[PDB]
């Protein structure tokens, strides 16, 4: 499957896709404004995630940091970025279809619209500023807005035993982006596309 990946935003980012234990494609790459990057990802990927990654810094060896994102300091991601990431989530082929969602459980750092470019169903976007209107216990300092399972680390907000509902936290995510998962147990947002489709993932795509 092809996901062209699409930065719209007026800065850099990098691009990050991962299946939490190996890298997609290359894994990562630099995206200025307005440049597009183009991954194949195989068949049958299960729990596939796409993300964008702010002010980073690389050496001649891919290794350095991330503000947001950042996985385990590499260019290259192989496993899934530090919170606060708005993420493209995807399980491909399975049982002949793919599901593809836009998640705010582990927060948000950049606007996204994730699309098929080939027929058969709807779009997903979460475009809404979060960052600009995030409440003040959720600012991460290093940029973003994170979730309150990583900044409160309890049950309820992390949803430990599977007996969790939504919060003044989730619903501010759900308010802002009704189309993005808000916490692990909201309603589904979840588009079911004809399996082996192909797709756009695009950073900042109204501004």
Known sequence: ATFEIVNRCSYTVWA?????????????????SGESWTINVEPGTKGGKIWARTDCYFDDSGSGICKTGDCGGLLRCKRFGRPPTTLAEFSLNQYGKDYIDISNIKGFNVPMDFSPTTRGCRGVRCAADIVGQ??????????GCNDACTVFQTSEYCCTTGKCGPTEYSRFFKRLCPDAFSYVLDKPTTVTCPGSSNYRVTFCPTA
Do not use: E, I, M, Y
Not at 18 to 26: I, Q, R
Not at 134 to 143: E, F, I, S, T, V
């Open 16 to 32: 990050a896709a991962s299946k939490g234990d190996a890298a997609l494609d290359a894994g990562g790459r630099q995206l200025n």
């Open 134 to 143: 995030c409440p003040a216990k959720l600012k991460a300092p290093g940029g």
